[PDB]
């Protein structure tokens, strides 16, 4: 089984997948973000960030009034499943998350900085 994903946000305000497969039998989970492009962070920054779908828009609504001083998350959300740091081009970072936080249940991943760039996660 494969317990990782290696996903990309460009220039362009995309990510280049909007579904990521979580194999079933994984204990453990890592997302490998990186940035191809030229747009520092500061124009064009991305993260990778986790919630259940149901609660996307709570944490985009919290975030948003939190702002650029907290990369648009609320601290310690307690519906962020996980989140990577805010990136630009050239630059990656990776977050690993415990399969055991995932049940049900629809997941979906977003950028905080941009809360158009979204896509699924689901354990198959
Ligand atoms: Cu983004």
């Known amino acids: 089984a494969e317990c990782s994903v290696d996903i990309q946000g460009n220039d362009q305000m995309q990510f280049n997948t909007n579904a990521i497969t979580v194999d079933k039998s ?19 920054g991305h993260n990778w960030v986790l919630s259940t779908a149901a609660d996307m828009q709570g944490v985009v609504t919290d975030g948003m009034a939190s702002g650029l001083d907290k990369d648009y998350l609320k601290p310690d959300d307690s519906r962020v499943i ?43």
């Open 26 to 44: 994984c204990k453990q989970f890592t997302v490998n973000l990186s940035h191809p492009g030229n747009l520092p962070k500061n124009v064009m």
């Open 82 to 124: 996980a989140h990577t740091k805010l990136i630009g081009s050239g630059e990656k970072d990776s977050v690993t998350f415990d399969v055991s936080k995932l049940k049900g249940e629809q997941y979906m991943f977003f950028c905080a900085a941009h809360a158009a760039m979204k896509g699924t996660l689901t354990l198959k």
